[PDB]
Amino acid sequence: VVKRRVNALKNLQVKCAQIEAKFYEEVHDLERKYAVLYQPLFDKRFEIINGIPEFWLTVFKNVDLLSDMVQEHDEPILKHLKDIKVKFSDAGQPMSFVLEFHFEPNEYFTNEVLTKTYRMRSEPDDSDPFSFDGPEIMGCTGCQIDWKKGKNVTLKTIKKKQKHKGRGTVRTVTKTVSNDSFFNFFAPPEVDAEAILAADFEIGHFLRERIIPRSVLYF
Amino acid sequence: VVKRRVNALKNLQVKCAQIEAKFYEEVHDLERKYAVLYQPLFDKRFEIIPKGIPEFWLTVFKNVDLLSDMVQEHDEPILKHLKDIKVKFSDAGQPMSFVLEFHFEPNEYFTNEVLTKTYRMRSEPDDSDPFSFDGPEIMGCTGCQIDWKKGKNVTLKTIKKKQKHKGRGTVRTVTKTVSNDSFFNFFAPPEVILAADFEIGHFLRERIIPRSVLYFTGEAIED
Amino acid sequence: QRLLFSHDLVSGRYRGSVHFGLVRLIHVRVQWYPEGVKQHVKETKLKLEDRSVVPRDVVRHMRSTDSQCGTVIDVNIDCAVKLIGTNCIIYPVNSKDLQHIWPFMYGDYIAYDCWLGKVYDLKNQIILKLSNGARCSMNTEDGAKLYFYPGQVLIGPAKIFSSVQWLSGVKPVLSTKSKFRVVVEEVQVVELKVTWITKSFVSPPPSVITQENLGRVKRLDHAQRQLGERCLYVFPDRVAVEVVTTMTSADVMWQDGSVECNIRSNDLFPVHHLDNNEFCPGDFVVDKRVQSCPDPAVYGVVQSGDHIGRTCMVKWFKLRPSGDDVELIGEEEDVSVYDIADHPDFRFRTTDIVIRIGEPSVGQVARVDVSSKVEVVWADNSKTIILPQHLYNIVFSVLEFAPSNHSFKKIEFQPPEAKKFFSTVRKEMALLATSLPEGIMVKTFEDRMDLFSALIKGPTRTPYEDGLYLFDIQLPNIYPAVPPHFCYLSQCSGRLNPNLYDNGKVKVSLLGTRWTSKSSLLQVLISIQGLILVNEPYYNEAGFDSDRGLQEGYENSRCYNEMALIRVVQSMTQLVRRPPEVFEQEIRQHFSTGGWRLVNRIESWLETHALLPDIGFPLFPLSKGFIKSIRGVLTQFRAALLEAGMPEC
Amino acid sequence: MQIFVKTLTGKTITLEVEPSDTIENVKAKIQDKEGIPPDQQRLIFAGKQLEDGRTLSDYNIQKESTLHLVLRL
């Protein structure tokens, strides 16, 4: 008896979740508009950075989530980072945010601006009152960095030790091996891989909400 | 030299916090607007809530740790007559404030139909202009009156005790009224635990009122 | 004397506070397991609380002056247990009571329908009850990150429960901002990859047995419950407990036959190393007397022995040709241990896995009875008696011609660069001819020039003194890149030297079993004169280097001096009786000069011991067993020399 | 010469083996009779782990003698 109306009330909660999805959609719209309003402030930052040394490198180093990715040999690279901003998707397409990292001319790659994107959700998943605590993160878009010759750090040219068959003589062979670096999540794992996806999602969320709109507090 | 540039960055961050405060005020306004869309669903819930769902909100309290600890065996029969809990919001132009209306059906314990424990949140860029900090956070409650019938109160309980006279030690076998732990103390905040009451109200604001289904069926958890 | 040994329970100061710990490593390393990490600390600063006597362990009384040995049968552990999360401590709780935390564990032997096997790996799943009241199951790999015992309480972000199976209760909605709190009800084993070893009374079954077939898998049992081992205590109501103290009171069967049951372990200390001629009651042995026990079918079982006397009494058995029974050939007391050797095949000792051969079929050895039969705990079903018969267990010259059935054949030696090998051997021969003043000498066959053959004389004041030893050396194809392939001609049916194996193998650092292309046969001969033939050859098997100055070291070294004297006399006897086809004339000449001096010296040792002691290497406490064995072999050596035509000087 | 090899499944293999024969031939015959490959079995006589590379006679095997089959893995 009661269970029937409880189930109907659950179906009602599903519509409540849909309404909340529309709420968060317009929340993203407000985020975009107010970001247009932030643009003068972020631009004034940009010109001010022209400059606070290694600004965003220090910002990342001071955050627990991000210091984990920045390796020592990375410091010469990320230090040439000149700015970071967030762009928000326009109406009609699925909600997403694009973190854009503006890099000055360097000796490590030619990309004036590098891009990376996160697509959020805007809908529930079934007829049960499924979880949606705002726009969460599924998937992510890696990109290729226009590295200079042999300047890639995501892969390291290790002189792996090998032995000749039968003879047994030792030798060194130059082979590319996956290397840990701050740039590694720019090539996220494809469709422990899921754990790394979740970690990257959380890191990008922290970049969007905490790092970028409050970069000064983290310097 | 660099100090001047970082100071400029901080002052830009101050405007940043101001614009973010405007953003959050607009977010509250959009929540008010989406109320017009929400309350049809919560009104269907009200009407549907053996007739209806007995002790729906008491059961929700029990299945929430933040609320089960606040429900006492004596309270349960009284709070059983809790008809609904629903959230209202402040009008345009007012400081961000919302109300957790406990609508309560007629009973034998207390009379007033509703208990409206208003809340409020910070709406300023920061306490100090040089510094910067923001985000919606409860900076104050309001509480509301609670009447009672003769002997039906539970916030303060009447007992017979052999008390010890203060400063003389004499024994007095007399009746006394002593403050008692009860659920309805939730409606009586300390006139300026405060943080705990604030967070519990915020929980009822964002989880238990909006998504009551998840916490009633056992389909959601909180610690 | 050393007073701590592996796994022993100790009390000492860590971080300035007294704490319990287990010694893990010795020549000491102590891990204060309750809360701490391994660190080195000496025993003088420490206070023992419970020694780690475990079955199969040979022990000696700490206080009793009698150095008699004994093997430990069973150990009774009265252990204090602290409940986890809480701090209630119950003492004394007997370890036989405590049960393992998981039904099966990594590598603990198991038995399938009719197969034995080690669980190489086991996939296990936890069963959780949520504050919501929902019961679920999860693989431990996912649960590793939940901020594992029945009754635990943990917390976890909702997403961790994405892959679980919701056994019962209302399924909660998984939101990234929800944190479930879980109480672990039971820990279960999902699958297990069995690395089978033996079939027990076709082909192996499936490696990863399906969960539905785990009900037939039976673990192994024994109690080695160490400090800090999670387990489940049952009230006289399973509760997760950690052992905080242990009370090792073990039963000991001593070398005199007495069984001193319930002796505090602190009064015992184990012997890391036996002289290979000790034989605690039950150790199966075979005779080495030339005349006695001509039939190979007979074997021996030692009943008791006197350590100071180095003499043990044995029973000789042989199998019945019909049926599966055994008969007693006879009891022989006063038998020197040197005349008996650890039986090649039967090596039964406590807690040794065994399989029944032509009902329970897989088990462990508990005690080897002084009688013929042996005691096996089949799983934990019952201790049963079974014969060994059906219980499987788990100077220089260049001689001409070629060596006749000698040195190295079947080789077809072919150096990749013969010219460089010749270049090497030229300088090797020059060095050998130039720097061999200690009498040691070598020779090379014309055919297969790599076939070196050397005779080595023992130094003075050592059991091998006047000891002649023949070595055949095959030079490798890629010499001098790698050490030479040595082979000691072995005929004594014994180990005259901890490295000179009866199989013909030799062992020393220079032989790579350090070396360099600059290394030469001269260096190897120098080493053989310095290490292989040394004053106390007991110090040359896979270590014992710590023993310098240890009383156990001295005792075992004296016994090994005795055994080496017996075996060198045996080797000389054989060599005189049946010498090879090479190196013969010099063997004659050596035996004429000093060969009879060996027997005279040994007899002088015996006479001096009887009267009471000379000097030269540890032999002074000559023992009844040594006297008997040395006389029995020395009369044989005299007979061989006489029949060989070597008259006394 | 007549010998008997006992397997763990209860069967008995009656074999004719020359006393001077090697144990490898015995393993081959056991494989032929039951299929177990020589590398995968051990022969046990009165508890002795028979070594492949040595003649049966020097193991003192006699007429109507008993052998037992064990498996290695």
**CB-CB under 8 Å, A216 with B132:** yes
Alpha carbon of B210: minimum distance to chain C alpha carbons (Å): 15
Q: Which of C114, C198, C345 sits opposite D47 (nearest CB)?
A: C345
Which value in Å is the resolution of this experimental model? 3.5
Q: How many domains does chain A have?
A: 2
CB C184 within 8 A of CB C149: yes
Residue type present at position D38: P
Token reading at C81: 């247990």
Alpha carbon of A209: minimum distance to chain C alpha carbons (Å): 16
Q: How many CB atoms lie within 10 A of CB C281?
A: 24
Chain B residues near residue A126 by CB distance under 8 angstroms: none
Whose tokens are 């400081």? That residue is B95
Chain A residues near residue B213 by CB distance under 8 angstroms: 6, 9-10, 12-13, 129
Residues A32 and A120 in one domain: no
CB C581 within 8 A of CB C403: yes
Q: Identify which of B70, B71, B103, B106 has the alpha carbon closest to the alpha carbon of residue B88.
A: B103
Are chains D and C touching, using the cut-off of 8 Å on CB pairs and a minimum of 3 such pairs?
A: yes
CA–CA gap between residue D45 and residue C82 (Å, rounded): 52
Could you give the residue ranges of the DSSP H alpha helices within D1-73?
23-34
List chains adjacent to chain A, taking adjacency as at least 3 C-beta pairs closer than 8 Å. Answer: B, C
Alpha carbon of C169: minimum distance to chain B alpha carbons (Å): 9
Q: Which of A3, A7, A23 to mutate to test the interface with B (most CBs of B within 10 A)?
A: A23
Q: Identify which of C223, C87, C99, C91 has the alpha carbon closest to the alpha carbon of residue C150.
A: C99
List chains adjacent to chain C, taking adjacency as at least 3 C-beta pairs closer than 8 Å. Answer: A, B, D
Residue A37 CB partners (closer than 8 Å, separation 6+)? B19
Residues A73 and A97 in one domain: yes
CB A57 within 8 A of CB A79: yes
Residue of D nearest to C387 (CA): D47
Residue B50 CB partners (closer than 8 Å, separation 6+)? A1, A2
**CB-CB under 8 Å, B214 with C180:** no
Q: Does B152 touch chain A (CB under 8 A)?
A: no
Could you give the count of Cα atoms lying within 13 Å of C369 in the half-sphere of its Cβ?
A: 12
**CB-CB under 8 Å, B217 with C175:** no
CB pairs under 8 A between C and D: 44
**CB-CB under 8 Å, B221 with C130:** yes
Phi/psi of residue C328, each to 5°? -90, 110
Taking any CB pair shorter than 8 Å as contact, residues of chain B touching chain C are 63, 65, 214, 217-223
**CB-CB under 8 Å, A129 with C176:** no
Chain B residues near residue A13 by CB distance under 8 angstroms: 211-214
Q: Does B213 touch chain A (CB under 8 A)?
A: yes
CB C340 within 8 A of CB C403: no
Residues A93 and A43 in one domain: no
Chain B residues near residue A52 by CB distance under 8 angstroms: 2, 5-6, 9
Residues A45 and A148 in one domain: no
Chain A residues near residue C178 by CB distance under 8 angstroms: 131
In angstroms, how far is CA C37 from the centroid of its own chain? Answer: 29
> At C278, is the secondary structure helix, strand, or coil?
coil
CA–CA gap between residue C616 and residue C595 (Å, rounded): 18
Chain C residues near residue A132 by CB distance under 8 angstroms: 175
Residue of B nearest to A33 (CA): B23
Q: Does C200 touch chain D (CB under 8 A)?
A: yes
Residue B75 CB partners (closer than 8 Å, separation 6+)? B154, B182, B183, B184
CA–CA gap between residue C385 and residue C348 (Å, rounded): 13
CA–CA gap between residue C162 and residue C185 (Å, rounded): 19
CA–CA gap between residue C413 and residue C484 (Å, rounded): 13
Residue C24 CB partners (closer than 8 Å, separation 6+)? C6, C7, C30, C31, C38
CA–CA gap between residue C581 and residue B79 (Å, rounded): 110
List chains adjacent to chain B, taking adjacency as at least 3 C-beta pairs closer than 8 Å. Answer: A, C
CA–CA gap between residue C7 and residue C227 (Å, rounded): 9
List chains adjacent to chain D, taking adjacency as at least 3 C-beta pairs closer than 8 Å. Answer: C
Q: Which of A210, A217, A218, A219 to mutate to test the interface with B (most CBs of B within 10 A)?
A: A217
- C596-611 vs C551-577: helix crossing angle, rounded to 10: 140
Bridging pattern class, strands D2-6 and A170-178: unpaired
CB C92 within 8 A of CB C79: yes
Q: Which of D8, D47, D73 sits opposite C201 (nearest CB)?
A: D8
Alpha carbon of A161: minimum distance to chain B alpha carbons (Å): 49
Residue C401 CB partners (closer than 8 Å, separation 6+)? C445, C446, C447
Token reading at C472: 């055949």
Alpha carbon of C139: minimum distance to chain B alpha carbons (Å): 22
Chain B residues near residue C169 by CB distance under 8 angstroms: 218
What are all long-range contacts of A10-15, with beta carbons under 8 Å and residues at least 24 apart?
Answer: A10/A128, A10/A129, A10/B213, A10/B217, A10/B219, A11/A127, A12/B41, A12/B44, A12/B45, A12/B213, A13/A129, A13/B211, A13/B212, A13/B213, A13/B214, A14/A124, A14/A127, A14/A128, A14/A129, A14/A130, A15/B41
Q: Which of C173, C176, C177 sits opposite A130 (nearest CB)?
A: C173
Q: Which of C159, C175, C177 sits opposite A198 (nearest CB)?
A: C159
CA–CA gap between residue C137 and residue C620 (Å, rounded): 70
Q: Does D71 touch chain C (CB under 8 A)?
A: yes
Whose tokens are 């030339």? That residue is C290
Residue of C nearest to D46 (CA): C389
Chain C residues near residue B214 by CB distance under 8 angstroms: 172-173
CA–CA gap between residue C591 and residue C595 (Å, rounded): 4
Whose tokens are 């242990």? That residue is C246
Chain B residues near residue A31 by CB distance under 8 angstroms: 23
Q: Which of B65, B217, B222 sits opposite C170 (nearest CB)?
A: B217
Chain A residues near residue B45 by CB distance under 8 angstroms: 9, 12
CA–CA gap between residue C473 and residue B112 (Å, rounded): 110
Q: Which of A128, A129, A133 sits opposite C176 (nearest CB)?
A: A133
Give the neighbor-by-neighbor strand order of the sheet with C284-287. C326-336, C311-319, C299-306, C284-287, C340-342
Q: How many CB atoms lie within 10 A of CB C354?
A: 24
DSSP conformation letters of C157-193? EGGGGGS-EEEESPPPP--TT-EEEEEEEEEEEEEEE
Which of A28, A50, A72 is a domain's end point?
Answer: A50
Q: Which domains does chain D have, with CATH numbers?
A: 2-71 (3.10.20.90)
CA–CA gap between residue B116 and residue B113 (Å, rounded): 10
Residue of D nearest to C325 (CA): D46
Backbone dihedral region for residue B112 (phi beyond 0: left; psi -120 to 50: alpha; all else: beta): beta
Q: Does D28 touch chain C (CB under 8 A)?
A: no
Q: How many CB atoms lie within 10 A of CB A163?
A: 10
Judged by CB atoms within 8 Å, which residues 100-139 of A form the interface with B? 128-129
Phi/psi of residue B2, each to 5°? -60, -30
Chain A residues near residue C176 by CB distance under 8 angstroms: 131, 133, 136
Q: Does C389 touch chain D (CB under 8 A)?
A: yes
Q: Does D48 touch chain C (CB under 8 A)?
A: yes
Q: Does A48 touch chain B (CB under 8 A)?
A: yes
Alpha carbon of C172: minimum distance to chain B alpha carbons (Å): 4
| Cα–Cα distances in angstroms (integers) from residue C116 to residues C212, C425, D44, in the given order | 19, 54, 18
Owning domain of residue A194: 51-219
Are chains D and A touching, using the cut-off of 8 Å on CB pairs and a minimum of 3 such pairs?
A: no
CB pairs under 8 A between B and C: 33
Are chains B and D touching, using the cut-off of 8 Å on CB pairs and a minimum of 3 such pairs?
A: no
Residue C497 CB partners (closer than 8 Å, separation 6+)? C464, C532, C533, C537, C540, C564
